[PDB]
From a paper:
AsfvPCNA is a hypothetic sliding clamp family protein; it is coded by the E301R gene that is highly conserved in ASFV strains. The crystal structures were determined at atomic resolution and confirmed that AsfvPCNA can assemble into a homotrimeric ring-shaped structure. Different from homologous protein structures, AsfvPCNA has a very unique amino acid sequence and conformation at the IDCL, J-loop, and P-loop regions, which are involved in partner recognition by PCNAs.
Unlike the Form I structure, the Form II AsfvPCNA structure belongs to P1 space group; per asymmetric unit contains six AsfvPCNA molecules, which assemble into two homotrimeric ring structures. The overall conformations of Form I and Form II AsfvPCNA trimers are virtually identical, supported by the very low root mean square deviation (RMSD, 0.2 Å) value over 840 pairs of Cα atoms. The three AsfvPCNA protomers arrange in a head-to-tail fashion, embracing all Domain I and Domain II α-helices at the inner face of the ring. We could not obtain any AsfvPCNA crystal in the absence of dsDNA, whereas Form I and Form II AsfvPCNA crystals readily grew when 10 bp dsDNA (5′-CCCATCGTAT-3′; 5′-ATACGATGGG-3′) is present in the sample. Likely, due to the dynamic binding or sliding of the DNA, the electron density is diffused, and no DNA was included in the final structures. Although it is ordered in the 7DRH structure, the four residues (298NNTI301) are all disordered in the Form I and Form II AsfvPCNA structures, suggesting that AsfvPCNA C-tail is very flexible and can undergo large conformational changes in solution.
Residue numbers in the entry:
A (entry chain B), B (entry chain C), C (entry chain A): 0 to 3, 20 to 297
Write the structure that this text describes.
């Protein structure tokens, strides 16, 4: 091609191929690699996929059942998107693990196709433009494990609900990785504490006669922290390290919104380019 | 010396030291490190060495006995080379493995000496010019395990023979590594297919109801592919991944010629600087 | 603060906090990480700490009992230092291993505090100025093993004594690591030899009918070698590789002075910024 140029068309009215029920093309395939590193860290067995005329969404549940993941890629932020209707697919994560891991900078495009012709097949095409090498994967997919809780959970990450979480701040992926890696050296639970008003966010654990550790954020503005906690009321929850480390180590994005409510439920929002990644830990 | 200059004299009429049956000096010692990484990957037991007044050649077979390696370093492309006559040596690869692995950029010169004086000894000298540090290895070597097949194999790689292989192309070392690492995630055999004419090179494997994978090179000119296959004839062979991955992972050179014939025999030619490396997989 | 400024006060007349028996602050926390990597490599169980109004010193003995480490950080080369008197502390290395390993470039300051109030506690504060994140460790410390040998050993490293070691030279950490890693591939003991006069330093080992190795420093000036050995007298000792590799791999400094005496005792002096590190191997 041009060597020493891909456009973003968004959703299309019709597919190039006629038998295509879904056509997807995107110029940042590393998004998918980091997305499935996350699924691997979570030890997810099956990935549920919902395709609609506007976007494609991947659903998963961590092995422990504590975490739910909702990862949506928006048709209009993507290089090429068409979907005929709303339909669902199941993918075995172990089957596609190494395929997604084989994505590197030599590929500048990822293409996903599903045809009526081949209703049990999902195509993943990776293109190396240096040598016009096309790498096509034919993946056998099931009809999904139609999970009744996916209604409640997509409900749970709505705008009306999130604004009522009284404690929220932002981390870079590196900062999230550093905090919860260090914590994992010494504990499986950390306490998150915030006095109402303009006092610092406190993260700590206490082991008697050995080691206590206290992490304190003395400038709320520098982590984009905002508190709704009534003045002189104490917010205090305990959260598990493991699943958070899984997300942070996956480095899926660059900035991550953290949302806490008083009964211990966390929500992580990491939004990068076309991907909006949501983690609900109940 | 001069710090903040080595010449290439080629083959010499006479040796510096009088008792030297072989004198070899070269300013790219990393060549030898990557060569013996390859021998390690192959699990080669013994390396056969033939010295002649013009060049030195290393011979080995892999453990699985499918592959034979011929690595020749040309006297005239080297900084300093003398050999009195044709003679042979055997080297235990396990004995010298860590030696060759200890080569790094702090060494700017490798020297190899064999004296009549010490007929069972091979000297390897590595020179660090920053601090004028000379690292001398005295390696005990044997009388070669004189392998009758080395006559057939060195013939099989003449170019009278080679220019009749009907399918040939070129990869960078990192392209070869990428193809056969990805393949090795899912299969031990890959099919190589090429229709006669100007159709694409096809690499693929098929597993029913799980995963099929197809790699296709849509521009033969970009991999320097040339086909001798009659119009509308199908060339199709199956090749083992393992030994090819061993060569590719060793990254011995920048570009590699791949040559295929119809009964499944491959030849890999990776030529870098003074070293011409040949892999025959029968 | 100021982003796109820390001063070196040295010793203070009196402490900021009134209950502080020790206040220590330093702008190169990686010094402590590499120090405790060294202690880990040595498999040190307990670290003895002596605080005085002028400096703080860490003592350790390797597991094998061969090596003694004395690491003193000078109050006057540090950003902030106060100590009320001479007192001693014991630290379990396993307890603080991961804490010291959690130091990275995101921390620009390390602070160490000991108060009369909490006498069995040692505070380590790491500050991330990008987001004003303070990470405070509360470490439980013991009263120290009263070790008789620490008197003899701090004497053994005095200037008066060191001047009589007849063989001394300097390595970069990268040179020390290279020499004793390569050596460790093939031997546990190396012979150090130096003829009196201006002959080269010799390091070698000899295994019959397999491999001998000789590394020779042909320019004493380039390793800052100075010999006190009478002309035509042979200095020859054997030294263990393991503990030297531990020091070299820890990369604690950039230059390391090596001192040898005729009965086989070595002393390593690695001095970087505030830290003066001494290794006595008897």
């Amino acid at each position: 091609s041009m060597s020493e140029n891909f456009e973003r068309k968004g959703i299309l009215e019709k597919p190039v191929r006629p038998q295509s029920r879904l056509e997807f093309s995107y110029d940042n395939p590393l998004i998918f690699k980091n997305l499935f590193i996350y699924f691997k860290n979570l030890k997810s067995k099956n990935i549920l996929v919902r395709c609609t005329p506007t976007e494609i969404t991947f659903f998963s549940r961590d092995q422990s059942q504590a975490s739910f993941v909702i990862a949506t890629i928006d048709g209009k932020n993507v290089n090429h998107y068409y979907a005929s209707d709303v339909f669902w697919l199941g993918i075995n994560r172990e089957l596609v693990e190494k395929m997604f891991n084989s994505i590197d900078r030599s590929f500048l495009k990822i293409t996903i196709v599903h045809r009526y012709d081949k209703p049990e097949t999902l195509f993943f095409i990776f293109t190396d433009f240096d040598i016009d090498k096309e790498c096509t994967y034919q993946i056998t997919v099931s009809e999904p494990e139609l999970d009744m809780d996916l209604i409640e959970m997509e409900k749970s990450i709505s705008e009306e609900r999130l604004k009522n979480y009284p404690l929220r701040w932002e981390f870079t992926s590196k900062q999230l990785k550093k905090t919860f890696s260090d914590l994992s050296n010494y504990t499986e639970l950390v306490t998150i504490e915030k006095l109402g008003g303009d006092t610092p966010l406190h993260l700590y654990f206490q082991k008697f006669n050995s080691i206590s550790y206290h992490e304190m954020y003395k400038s709320s503005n520098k982590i984009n922290l905002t508190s709704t906690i009534p003045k002189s009321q104490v917010f205090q929850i305990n959260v598990k390290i493991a699943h958070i480390k899984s997300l942070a180590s996956a480095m899926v994005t660059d900035k991550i919104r953290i949302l806490c409510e008083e009964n211990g439920n966390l929500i992580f929002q990491s939004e990068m380019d076309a991907l909006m990644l949501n983690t609900i830990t109940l």
